[PDB]
Nucleic acid binder design. Structure first.
Ligand SMILES: [Mg+2]
Lengths: 213, 441, 441, 213
DNA sequence: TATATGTGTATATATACACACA
DNA sequence: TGTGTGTATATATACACATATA
């Protein structure tokens, strides 16, 4: 057993059970209350995920988080994904810059050693509001800061709430985003190896050309 | 370099004794009146200072904990953060004194998120119950910015439940229903037979039975079939992880049960299927006892009502009724103090308003012109008049428009209104004011 | 359930790119003008907010870091605590912008105490070189309470030494002597040839040498005998633990040396006694080279001057003189802005003061008699007058004591003084004000 | 061998060497700078000391802080103190209630395993100011809170600084308290066992009776 | 005998990123 | 091919104290 794994009732058996990969303990406290007990499980991932591009499998498994991810599911780092405890893996991290642009693509890189979960659509991202604007009598949700800045001008007088992490949301909003999900089904392009090598790699000059355009 | 002999007896009788008495009177035993440990008093005083401007603004718990050191807090700010996170939830308090924004924990996970995520503000319960903050006692420590204790109208120490451990002493008070405490306070204030308040646990759908002083907190189970059973409630002390690891897990590896989670929006709930190895008796009474004992569905709790009274010393109460009576007797004195202070303040305000109105009426139509003179000699000339005496810096500090028709009458009407307020405050008594305050709830 | 496909290319080009650019432009690379990373700017803004009413009061690092989230800080307060501790060390900064109270570390132990012990306030250096805060640019985010950047008169990015790692870009600028930087700024402002500022480390008694764009930081040793030597200084990259565990102890556990701690008021003093099997060559040059190489007494550094300019973009400089020239060119515009705004504000102030002073003389036996009319009578009749067209509200809001000769002549004196000051502000130029404010350091 | 232990140049040689038992690592700062390098060594503890009264030797040695006081010194739990690396043991702790009320007497109870150390005066307590009052142009140092309260009324207008720990002290004050130290030499009374049993024994009724007088 | 509750005393540990210097 | 710098992500531990209950 895994200490902080929260098992779904149908986990391991034949169902569409989804594993929720939060980026901390604080982001999963409300998950067990607002989830589908038969079909949802969770596991908190501590901090920034290991940069596992070009690493060996033995080096990969030396990380507690990656080892626990492989243990909770049926994923063997050198074998195919055939018999898994969870049908879907739903990465649901904090929507700020660190969670969305560092932990999420690194987790995608770690899951890229099984480039068939992506093809079958079993790798998902749970959209989470980074900005919650109290416009008049209604709450508007902005998932990325760029969207809010683009749409900030054409709104009436309001006050915004910045969602630093999923522990900043209330149970009503957590329940709304869990039982009424917005899923981004990640699909790997033909040249996914080049995009992963550029962002995750030894050469830092490849990130300078990319960042200058 | 100085070398002085110091026997261990002196060390134990001075420094160790000081630390023990500090842990008792200033760390872990709550005050009887407001029900605050000193850290909670600091947290709520800082939250009040933060909410001075806008009362509906949510402030980060880190922001609240940072400023308590300037109010007289002498410890780490993580203790203040943890104390604040335990005061702003609706699963552990019957009468929360802070609203929280974010993940402050639940009955399943009794652990709030990190203080970098969650915000807090002073609750409407605090404003509804805690009255006469301006008349609260002044702490003997000049560096203690918050008062010695706040002045609520009902005993909050009985509402949320206190558990504290000190050196040599410990306190454990169970939470009580707000309605029963208010009714008991009303009965004590009116001079009646005080009915013992009922013990109520927040977000609890089970039973609480008082037997021989002990309190039995009982969960609920039902039987869907011969071998299937649904647990609808568990005793208040348990978590999801704690109950699973202590009861539900050391029953499946023993080959007795197979359990599934059903902890829906209602709260705690499980579905247990009984294997053939685990056998139940024919009759319902022994089977009920065995089931309710094996699954840990009974929690037995005793009450150790140890509180710091209004004199700062320790006090142990046999029950809750005596505590309520003592609290009411203490609070009536502060209601009387409020009445006296408001009488004096209304008298002073009426005197000032009438003096200003007379000064205006003399300026527009009278010998006083405030032209062709100086400031110091005008002040002396005003100080000549007995009525204008003691108000010379507030009479010449009035604006020009106060000499207009629309603003000369307003001063006289304000003087009349303040006189009527002073007359109102000179006829009420402690009982009526306290009854009105209770009626506010 | 809104199952929308999303390619990895779009993810990388939107969210990964946003995070990388945010790390470059908002976390790691300092601003060229005020020499602040955004966390340091938030800490400075909060400390300035806490300094209102008492410039000399010391505030806990917890107190400073708690309120930065209200100013628009979107990260955990621990990073703010660490940055604030690093900004008040003096042993690490040539120009400390925060004054510290408590243990903020030393060269021997380069680690500050926990934030629950240490206090900080705004240093006098900040009040000395950071001018024109009211004319600082406004950040495009309404929630970013501190300005886009502050406005120092000398480049503070060159004074304390900056090291930062972002995604794709990194910055490393060595600390420079404050006096040399000020002289170079004055030379650039006056249009003369600018001399390269000297690199100087805080509390370092070694030697810094420039060679082909690389800086050599050299410690010093002195031979007190044929076999015993005294290490008086070691390069700035070492603390006591690292030097002991990386140089002294590896040599000690080899039969080469035996070392004793000879530190004191000036840190990093050691006494090394060589053993028989460590052969000190008779050649003075070879002996010196061997002692430098074996004891790690030479550190080699190179600068990577990467900054954020006033437009928010990223700029890489190959020199410090170029940065100083660009900083002076940018700061001259803000000096001009200050001059223009002062002209406007002081003209408005003189107009208001003259209007008030003439209104008061026109109330003392004048055509305007306040008494006997309503509020609208004054607020409309005076609004008719051209001179009081936009000042009637402040005209009628003045106090009664502004009607005696003593306080009536003071209004005219204030008007005349404001007129003279505005006339003074209408003749100065950028160079004069810059020279005046530079020479006051 | 012992990590975080700063060694004196005459540790293990015949000298008046002193070991400063410091509570926490933030309090050990500034000691390496202001200490006598040939005669002063230091070791940072970690918070509250384990209650060792009535404990077994194999159980005391399981505490890392207590284990690294018998390693830094030559102390053996079952043997007399005859070959010691440090001549004196100077306990220097924060002068607040917690430090000098729990950590100091607990350390005394631990060192009571060798009463010959107390008989020789080798156990000392370094007095540290808890309150520094800026009175006029001078500074007043108060080592205990009760000491400050006893003279607060007669003191003129002043501002006090509360010293939570040694990490709240300036380098000048740290140097003044170290190079001009005010020691208190601990001497065990004839009935020290009864006092230690009262303070640290398993019966809280004795503590109640002691506190009620 | 063994837990556990809440206010306190002190610490700690993986990760990402660039790049020059060993 | 390590590695140290400093903002960020997230988390963890060992201690004391009492008293009822299992
Ligand atoms: Mg300390």
């Amino acid at each position: 057993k895994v200490h902080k794994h929260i098992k779904a009732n149908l986990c391991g058996k034949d169902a569409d059970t989804t594993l929720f990969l939060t980026e901390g303990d604080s982001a999963i406290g409300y998950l067990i209350d607002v989830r589908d007990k038969e079909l949802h499980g969770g596991y908190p991932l501590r901090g920034k995920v290991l940069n596992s591009w070009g690493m060996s499998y033995a080096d990969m498994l030396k990380n507690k988080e990656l080892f626990d991810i492989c243990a909770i599911t049926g994923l063997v780092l050198g074998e195919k994904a055939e018999n898994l405890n969870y049908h879907n893996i739903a990465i649901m991290t904090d929507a700020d810059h660190d969670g969305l642009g560092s932990i999420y693509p690194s987790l995608l890189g770690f899951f890229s050693n099984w480039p068939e979960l992506f093809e079958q659509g079993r790798i998902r991202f749970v959209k989470t509001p980074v900005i919650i604007a109290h416009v008049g009598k209604k709450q508007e949700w902005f998932y990325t800061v760029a969207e809010y800045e683009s749409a900030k001008d054409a709104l009436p007088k309001h006050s915004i709430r910045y969602i630093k992490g999923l522990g900043s949301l209330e149970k009503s909003e957590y329940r709304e985003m869990i039982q009424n999900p917005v899923y981004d089904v990640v699909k790997l392009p033909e040249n996914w190896k080049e995009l992963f090598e550029m962002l995750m790699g030894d050469n830092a000059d490849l990130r300078k050309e990319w960042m200058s355009q | 370099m100085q070398l002085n002999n110091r026997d261990l007896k002196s060390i134990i009788d001075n420094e160790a004794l000081a630390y023990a008495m500090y842990t008792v009177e200033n760390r872990a035993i709550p005050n009887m009146i407001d029900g605050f440990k000193p850290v909670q008093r600091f947290v709520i005083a800082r939250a009040l200072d933060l909410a001075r401007g806008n009362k509906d603004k949510f402030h980060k718990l880190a922001s609240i904990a940072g400023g308590v050191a300037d109010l007289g807090y002498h410890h780490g700010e993580n203790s203040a953060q943890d104390a604040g996170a335990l005061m702003a939830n609706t699963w552990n308090n019957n009468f929360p004194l802070l609203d929280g924004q974010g993940n402050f924990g639940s009955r399943t996970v009794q652990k709030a998120a990190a203080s970098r995520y969650i915000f807090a503000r002073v609750s409407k319960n605090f404003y509804n119950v805690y009255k006469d903050t301006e008349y609260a006692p002044v702490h003997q420590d000049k560096e203690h910015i918050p008062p010695a204790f706040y002045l609520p109208i009902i005993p909050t120490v009985l509402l949320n439940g206190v558990s504290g451990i000190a050196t040599g002493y410990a306190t454990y008070i169970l939470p009580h229903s707000v309605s029963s405490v208010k009714k008991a306070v009303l009965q004590a204030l009116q001079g009646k037979k005080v009915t013992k308040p009922k013990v109520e646990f927040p977000e609890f759908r089970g039973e609480v039975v008082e037997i021989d002083g002990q309190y039995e907190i009982r969960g609920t189970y039902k039987f869907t079939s011969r071998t299937q059973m649904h647990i609808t409630e568990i005793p208040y002390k348990y978590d999801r992880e704690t109950y699973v690891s202590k009861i539900l897990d050391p029953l499946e590896n023993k080959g007795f049960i197979t359990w599934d989670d059903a902890c829906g929006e209602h709260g705690f709930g499980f579905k247990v299927k009984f294997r053939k190895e685990y056998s139940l008796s024919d009759n319902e009474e022994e089977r009920h006892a065995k089931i309710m004992k094996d699954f840990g569905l009974i929690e037995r709790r005793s009450q150790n009502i140890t509180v710091i009274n209004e004199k700062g010393k320790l006090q142990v109460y046999d029950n809750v009724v005596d505590l309520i009576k003592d609290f009411v007797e203490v609070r009536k004195t502060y209601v009387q103090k409020r009445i006296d202070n408001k009488i004096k303040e209304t008298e002073s305000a009426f005197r000032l308003a009438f003096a200003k109105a007379h000064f205006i009426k003399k300026v527009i139509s009278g010998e006083i012109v405030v032209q062709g003179k100086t400031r110091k000699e005008l002040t002396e000339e005003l100080s000549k008049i007995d009525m204008y005496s003691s108000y010379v810096d507030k009479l010449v500090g009035m604006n020009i428009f106060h000499m207009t028709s629309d603003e000369a009458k307003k001063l006289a009407e304000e003087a009349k209104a303040k006189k009527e307020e002073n007359e109102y405050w000179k006829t009420t008594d402690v009982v009526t004011e306290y009854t009105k305050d209770l009626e506010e709830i």
